[PDB]
């Protein structure tokens, strides 16, 4: 825990707790409030898990050189949170954008989200999409791409617990699973009752959440 700061880990764990919301969400009926909170919770969870992880690894690289040259504490745990809040902010402005378009134009006037389609001749309601969720996905993709380059070069350190293995594999796993999930759900606007979807969200969440709790946390009792 001294090798890997307390507060980073409480941050991670809290954030991902929150990322478990998509699947208490859907059990309740879809409405306005539902899909919106979904996007809030998702994106908060996402950055405040994968982002901070990637930046921890950046610190590894810098402490290395710092230490090779003159041990003088180049990067500290005090440095992480700052290059966190930046990202937290950006995402706040974004949510405000989307949330504004709804809450000021298409709230009551012309459009809505609580909305259903049909399979052959039978009914099913849900939330739904537009182009925004597309761009969202593509951002997640690129972000972790940068993280992967980081966990590419950093492959040779003499280090204590080989955290790099563990982190980097969470990263790769997540990228993959996310590509697939989003691709399916963003073809499948029409062929989705509640159940089949709820399958899909259950998959994504327990997969990456449990994974990227465990890979880092648990081995730190062995």
């Amino acid at each position: 825990i001294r090798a890997s700061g307390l507060i980073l880990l409480e941050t991670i764990l809290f954030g991902s707790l929150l990322l478990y919301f998509p699947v208490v969400i859907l059990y309740f009926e879809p409405s306005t409030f539902r899909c919106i909170l979904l996007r809030w919770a998702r994106l908060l969870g996402f950055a405040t898990v994968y982002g901070t992880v990637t930046l921890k690894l950046h610190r590894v690289l810098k402490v290395f050189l710092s230490r090779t040259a003159q041990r003088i504490p180049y990067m500290t745990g005090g440095r992480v949170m700052r290059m966190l809040a930046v990202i937290l902010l950006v995402v706040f402005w974004f949510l405000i954008g989307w949330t504004s378009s709804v809450c000021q134009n298409l709230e009551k006037q012309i459009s809505l989200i609580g909305q259903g389609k049909t399979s052959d001749h039978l009914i099913f309601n849900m939330c739904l999409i537009d182009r925004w969720d597309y761009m969202t996905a593509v951002a997640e993709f690129l972000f972790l791409l940068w993280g992967v380059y980081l966990c590419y070069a950093v492959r040779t350190v003499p280090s204590a617990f080989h955290e790099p293995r563990y982190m980097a594999v969470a990263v790769h796993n997540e990228l993959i699973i996310s590509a697939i999930f989003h691709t399916i759900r963003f073809v499948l606007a029409s062929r989705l009752q509640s159940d089949w979807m709820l399958m899909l969200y259950f998959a994504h969440t327990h997969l990456t959440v449990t994974v990227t709790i465990g890979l880092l946390l648990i081995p730190k009792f062995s």
């Binding site: 290395f64 050189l65 090779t68 040259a69 070069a153 950093v154 350190v157 003499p158």
Partner: protein, 396 residues
């Protein structure tokens, strides 16, 4: 110093290798990613070997190339571990200041210098592999005092070389990378430095007498030696268990035991009996031959001289604790006149025996043994091979 000559020969090799008129051409490749000059492909060097050396086996020429390339005379541009692989990969010769023939010896501080320099040229990645990162960790933990001027001269060198043109920095850093591969190699491949600790380091009257002994040094023509060598080959040529063995039983190859077990059986095979017929010396080497020859000598009431010679040989085996105990006794039994076993001597023979018998010696009865031995070799063995028992035993 021995290996010096080895390196000299291989220097001859590479000198003929980068020949002006002949030689491999050091090309400049062009790629969709980059344009790399002054390299070549391992198939080139393989072809060069096969041409100018006539190394019939591709594998043999490849192994020669392998160890040459593991002595730092050329390296693969993208690898640490020196190995020549016949394919399209890019190589390079080495510099006359960085051969291995120049008695070079790096040391730990200098490894630290090269580590700091490589790690600090680029600062995009830990441009290294796990073993070298491991070595640098230890160098850190043990070199607590002395680091600074290391870092200093490292980046100094970096400026002094980057200041020269961009392809120059590349080729010089490639060379002075590989030359430290070879002198501190990856954990697996063998070092090619070390050596074994063994190599770790009247006057004219005697002259004239040497000349005279060369004169009386009886020699025979090489053709004579040729016949002797060919014939000694032939007479067992059909016994060679590598070339042409009649007993195909091979306990090594064909998972048999019977061949040696027949060899343990005292009954001689027909090979054995034909082989006895060459020389009684080989017979006496054979225990079986000793037994059968001795049987004939007994039944012919002629079992003494062999008894003597066996006595001499069995005497030449014990330590200095029993030499006197036997020599006097053996004299009193054979060489004392009046004993039953009557070995028979001439003047100088019995004179030598009487003079030496006071002093038990490791070469006590040399002339007497010669006398009786030429006797037996001249007489006994002939009639034995001519004997009915020999013929009946050789038939089957």
């Amino acid at each position: 110093s021995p290996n010096m000559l080895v390196y000299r020969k291989m220097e001859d090799v590479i000198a003929r290798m980068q020949d002006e008129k002949n030689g491999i051409p050091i090309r400049t490749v062009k790629s969709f990613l980059s344009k790399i000059p002054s390299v070549f492909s391992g198939s080139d060097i393989v072809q060069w070997l096969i041409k100018n050396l006539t190394i019939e086996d591709p594998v043999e020429a490849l192994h020669l190339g392998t160890l040459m390339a593991a002595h730092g005379y050329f390296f693969p541009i993208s690898d640490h571990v020196l190995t020549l692989k016949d394919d399209g990969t890019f190589y390079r010769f080495q510099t006359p200041y960085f051969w291995p023939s120049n008695c070079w010896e790096p040391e730990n501080t200098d490894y630290a210098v090269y580590l700091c320099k490589r790690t600090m040229q680029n600062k995009a990645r830990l441009e290294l592999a796990d073993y070298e990162a491991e070595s640098l960790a230890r160098l850190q933990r043990a070199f607590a005092r002395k680091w600074e001027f290391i870092f200093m001269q490292a980046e100094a060198q970096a400026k002094v070389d980057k200041k020269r043109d961009k392809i120059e920095r590349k080729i010089l850093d490639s060379q002075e990378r590989a030359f430290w591969d070879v002198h501190r190699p990856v954990p697996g491949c063998v070092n090619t430095t070390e050596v074994d600790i063994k190599k770790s380091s009247d006057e004219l009257q005697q002259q004239i007498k040497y000349w005279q002994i060369q004169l009386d040094r009886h020699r025979l023509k090489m053709s004579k030696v040729a016949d002797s060598l060919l014939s000694y080959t032939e007479q067992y040529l059909e016994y060679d268990p590598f070339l042409l063995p009649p007993d195909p039983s091979n306990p090594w190859l064909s998972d048999d035991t019977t061949f040696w077990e027949l060899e343990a059986s005292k009954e001689p095979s027909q090979q054995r009996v034909k082989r006895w017929g060459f020389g009684m010396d080989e017979a006496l080497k054979d225990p079986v031959g000793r037994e059968q020859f001795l049987k004939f000598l007994e039944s012919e009431f002629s079992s003494e001289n062999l008894r003597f010679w066996l006595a001499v040989e069995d005497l030449k085996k014990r330590p200095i604790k029993e030499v006197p105990s036997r020599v006097q006794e053996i004299w009193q039994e054979f060489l004392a006149p009046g004993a039953p076993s009557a070995i028979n001597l001439d003047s100088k023979s019995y004179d030598k025996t009487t003079q030496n018998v006071k002093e038990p010696g490791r070469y006590t009865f040399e002339d007497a043994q010669e006398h009786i031995y030429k006797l037996m070799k001249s007489d006994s063995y002939p009639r034995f091979i001519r004997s009915s028992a020999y013929q009946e035993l050789l038939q089957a």
